[PDB]
C-alpha cells in the first residue's frame, strides 16, 4: 500500500477497471475510487509529472504500446514490467458493406506472415528511440557488493 498507482480520469481503462469481475482488480478500483487525494490525471503528460515527481512512490497504468514507446524516449528513466492484463488489439477499420475490407485483411495477414510488421516495430520502437539497447544488464546483476564502499 506504500507506492500508489493511478489511471487516466476518463476513458475505456476506467470502464475496464470499473466493470471488472476479479476481486483483486475490484479492490484496486475501490482503492483508486476512494484515494486521498485523487490518483487520476487529465492528460498523459500530467501522469508523467505525477510519476517523475514522486521518486518511486507513484505508478501510472496505461497501454503497453504507449508504455514501451515512452520507455524508448528521453530521459530514458521509465520501464515496463508485467504481462498484458487484457487481450486488446488494433486493426484496420472499414465501414460495413464495403468491398475492400476483405482484401485489406488479406494484405494485413500477408504483412503479418512476412514479418514486415515486426520490422516496422523494430524500426520505429528500437532504432528510432533515444535510449540504449534492449539489454539493460549493465551492472543490473550485482551479485555480492558494490565496490564504492571498498573504494
Amino acid at each position: 500500500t506504500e507506492i500508489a498507482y493511478g489511471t487516466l480520469e476518463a476513458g475505456s481503462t476506467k470502464e475496464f477497471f470499473r466493470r471488472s469481475k476479479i476481486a483483486v482488480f475490484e479492490k484496486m478500483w475501490t482503492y483508486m475510487k476512494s484515494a486521498e487525494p485523487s490518483v487520476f490525471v487529465r492528460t498523459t503528460e500530467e501522469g508523467m509529472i505525477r510519476v517523475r515527481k514522486s521518486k518511486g512512490k507513484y505508478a501510472y497504468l496505461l497501454e503497453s504500446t504507449m508504455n514501451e514507446y515512452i520507455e524508448q524516449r528521453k530521459p530514458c528513466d521509465t520501464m515496463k514490467v508485467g504481462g498484458n492484463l487484457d487481450s486488446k488489439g488494433y486493426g484496420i477499420a472499414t465501414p460495413k458493406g464495403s468491398a475492400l475490407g476483405a482484401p485489406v485483411n488479406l494484405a494485413v495477414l500477408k504483412l503479418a506472415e512476412q514479418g514486415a510488421l515486426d520490422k516496422l516495430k523494430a524500426k520505429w520502437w528500437y532504432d528510432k528511440g533515444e535510449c540504449g539497447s534492449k539489454d539493460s544488464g549493465s551492472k543490473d546483476k550485482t551479485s555480492a557488493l558494490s565496490l564504492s564502499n571498498v573504494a
Binding site: 481503462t13 514507446y69 508485467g82 498484458n84 487484457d86 488494433y90 494484405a107 495477414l109 504483412l111
Partner: protein
Amino acid sequence: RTYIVTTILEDPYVMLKKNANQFEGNDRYEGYCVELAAEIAKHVGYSYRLEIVSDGKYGARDPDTKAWNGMVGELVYGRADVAVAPLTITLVREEVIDFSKPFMSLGISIMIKKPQKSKPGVFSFLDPLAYEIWMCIVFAYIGVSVVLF
C-alpha cells in the same frame, strides 16, 4: 478512382516532418501508420489521400443524440473511405463499421520511476551506526588514553 484515408496526430504513428512547410501531398507526415498505408497501397495498388480528423476525437456515440463523432462518424456519414489509425476494436464499434484482424496486440502494463544504482562512496561507509556516535567513540577513546597516561 480515388480513396480517402483519415488519421489523427499521434506519436509515433503520425508525426510532423521537419520540412513540413517545404513538403506537399501525402509525404508531409511520417511514422508507423504512414508506412503501413503505403504497404497497403503497394500490395493492393490504389491511390489514396491522407486526411486529418477535425475534432480530435477517435469515436464515441452520444446516447442523448444517438450520433457518432470522430473518424467513426466520418466513416458512417461517408466523409472518409478507410480509417488507418489505432482505433480500439470494441463491441459497440463492430455494429456500425467492420474491422480487420488485429496486427499488433497490446495490454495494460505498469510504469514506474525506474530507479538506478545510486550507490555513493564514502558516505555509504558511515551508514549503519550514525554520523555522530563515532565522535563520542573518539572522545571516549582519547579520554581513556588520558586516564591511562
